[PDB]
Design a protein around this ligand. Structure first.
Ligand SMILES: Nc1nc2c(ncn2[C@@H]2O[C@@H]3COP(=O)(O)O[C@H]4[C@@H](O)[C@H](n5cnc6c(=O)[nH]c(N)nc65)O[C@@H]4COP(=O)(O)O[C@H]3[C@H]2O)c(=O)[nH]1
Ligand SMILES: Nc1nc2c(ncn2[C@@H]2O[C@@H]3COP(=O)(O)O[C@H]4[C@@H](O)[C@H](n5cnc6c(=O)[nH]c(N)nc65)O[C@@H]4COP(=O)(O)O[C@H]3[C@H]2O)c(=O)[nH]1
Ligand SMILES: Nc1nc2c(ncn2[C@@H]2O[C@@H]3COP(=O)(O)O[C@H]4[C@@H](O)[C@H](n5cnc6c(=O)[nH]c(N)nc65)O[C@@H]4COP(=O)(O)O[C@H]3[C@H]2O)c(=O)[nH]1
Lengths: 195, 191
């Protein structure tokens, strides 16, 4: 009777705003973690996912590899063509990586013009060839400046990757993969290296 | 009648999430190094203000600022100092961008600002004040108490022509900034 029924009407209007918000919360959260320019994850979403995936590798005793990519000479590139064309080069490289990073792989915009990738349960030989396919894919086509149709020159990426040692943490693997990338850059750029 | 216990629990998850949702919203639109807006929140805000400036037949100006020789700061003093240089310049831009103005950290060590319904002359002198301001003081390294060097800001801006899209104004503002850098840095130029 009545008061029992004034309550079921308030609890239905209340557990419905729970779902109206919990669904709206999921889509604000998806976009809070999506790097707007490229539609990949951002460094934050990546550093969270890299830690969660290292738990799954220690507790499960499985494999995980990690890769970093930088767009070569990207600073002097912006100065030549302008912020807007540079944003289009970032987008383009990001399209090449996103194609290849279907889950359980995880790809992110790790920096200003840098990317990070997670290959869970995959051997390094696979990672090493995936990065090599991405390297030539990126420099395969000649891109054009959109109003004027100029050649932008080839676009190349340097690359670093490493395999997580048994006791290694997220931060630590990243440190090593980053040393790998610096090694690729100081060795002539447009190449992959590994520890 | 366990019912009053589930409605006390149900008007609680509404309070937990409605607050949590506004918190996630703020963080999706704020650069937590400088507390200005981030790039998404700006590009969205630019489209709103170019829409409203066309409906209202009124104008808006647009400014881009980059910190000069910023990479050399990270390299000499460390990334921990570099964040302080960004915070410092952002703070100058912040004191000066009270609403209806709108400042954000576009890109890496760059900023973008919206001046709606403002005379180009005032925007130009506002930017020039920002320029003398950041270079007015000689900052010291927190730990070791040493002169970090001069800090200067380059700057470019443009006013929106009547048919222009937000994309297009920023391209002009960006060309203006490239002229400032190419012409000696530490200055303001405009189309
Ligand atoms: N301590 C500290 N250092 C920071 C921070 N953010 C960026 N930096 C550092 O500053 C370097 C130079 O950035 P820049 O002078 O703004 O010059 C940047 C910028 O002009 C450009 N860039 C960055 N993001 C974008 C973008 O979304 N679009 C376009 N077109 N260009 C971008 O690439 C240039 C190179 O950037 P990177 O290679 O990533 O290298 C960056 C990065 O290592 C920070 O919060 N704290
Ligand atoms: N009078 C005075 N006020 C102080 C002092 N230390 C902190 N404050 C106040 O506290 C604010 C926060 O500074 P922060 O959190 O270190 O964050 C700072 C810091 O990261 C960077 N920054 C500004 N000036 C310097 C500097 O001289 N050296 C270094 N290393 N960083 C600076 O800019 C950020 C924003 O600073 P502000 O907007 O200026 O605002 C500063 C300033 O208003 C001080 O020694 N004297
Ligand atoms: N935590 C904190 N400490 C404060 C604050 N204001 C002053 N101090 C302390 O008091 C000393 C005197 O600083 P000042 O007279 O403001 O004179 C300052 C100020 O004119 C300038 N300065 C240094 N840091 C900042 C800063 O973060 N923001 C601003 N706006 N100015 C600064 O450098 C001078 C020397 O600063 P220091 O050698 O670091 O030594 C500073 C600092 O240790 C504050 O708001 N918060």
């Amino acid at each position: 009777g009545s008061h029992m029924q004034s309550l079921e009407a308030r609890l239905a209007d209340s557990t419905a705003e729970v779902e109206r918000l919990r669904e709206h919360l999921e889509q604000v959260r998806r976009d809070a973690t999506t790097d707007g320019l490229t539609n990949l994850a951002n460094r934050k979403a990546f550093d969270d996912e890299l830690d969660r995936a290292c738990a799954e590798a220690e507790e499960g005793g499985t494999t995980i590899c990690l890769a970093v990519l930088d767009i070569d000479h990207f600073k002097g590139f912006n100065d030549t063509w302008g912020h807007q064309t540079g944003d289009q080069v970032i987008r383009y490289v990001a399209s090449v990586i996103g194609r290849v990073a279907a889950p359980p792989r995880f790809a992110a915009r790790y920096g200003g013009a840098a990317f990070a990738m997670i290959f869970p349960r995959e051997a390094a030989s696979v990672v090493a060839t995936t990065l090599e396919e991405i390297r030539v894919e990126v420099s395969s086509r000649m891109l054009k400046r959109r109003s004027t149709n100029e050649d932008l020159g080839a676009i190349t990426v340097s690359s670093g990757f490493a395999e997580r040692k048994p006791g290694e943490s997220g931060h630590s693997v990243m440190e090593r993969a980053d040393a790998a990338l610096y090694a690729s850059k100081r060795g002539g750029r447009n190449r992959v290296t590994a520890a």
